[PDB]
Amino acid sequence: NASTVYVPTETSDTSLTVKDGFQWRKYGQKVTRDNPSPRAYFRCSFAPSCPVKKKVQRSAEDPSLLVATYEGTHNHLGPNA
Numbered sequence: 001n002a003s004t005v006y007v008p009t010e011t012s013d014t015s016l017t018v019k020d021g022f023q024w025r026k027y028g029q030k031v032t033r034d035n036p037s038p039r040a041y042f043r044c045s046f047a048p049s050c051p052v053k054k055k056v057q058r059s060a061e062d063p064s065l066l067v068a069t070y071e072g073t074h075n076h077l078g079p080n081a
């Protein structure tokens with residue numbers, strides 16, 4: 001149920017923001033010793049009607065990339081228009 005994409009991101013940008021046409025509510029953050037960098041947890045602004053969740057973290061393989069993982073598919077059009 002998950003799709004992962006890779007977003008090259010300036011290394012000085014630690015905000016864990018991936019712009020994707022949709023709106024998000026950040027609800028969680030995880031910090032762990034296996035990644036030097038936090039993981040941010042978001043739910044779609046159309047929650048609970050929309051089930052999509054989004055997790056963003058720097059790649060531990062290529063730290064020039066953010067890894068954005070989306071769970072679910074949006075059941076609505078993107079509100080950033």
Ligand SMILES: [Zn+2]
Nearest residue numbers: 044046050074
């Ligand atoms: Zn949605």
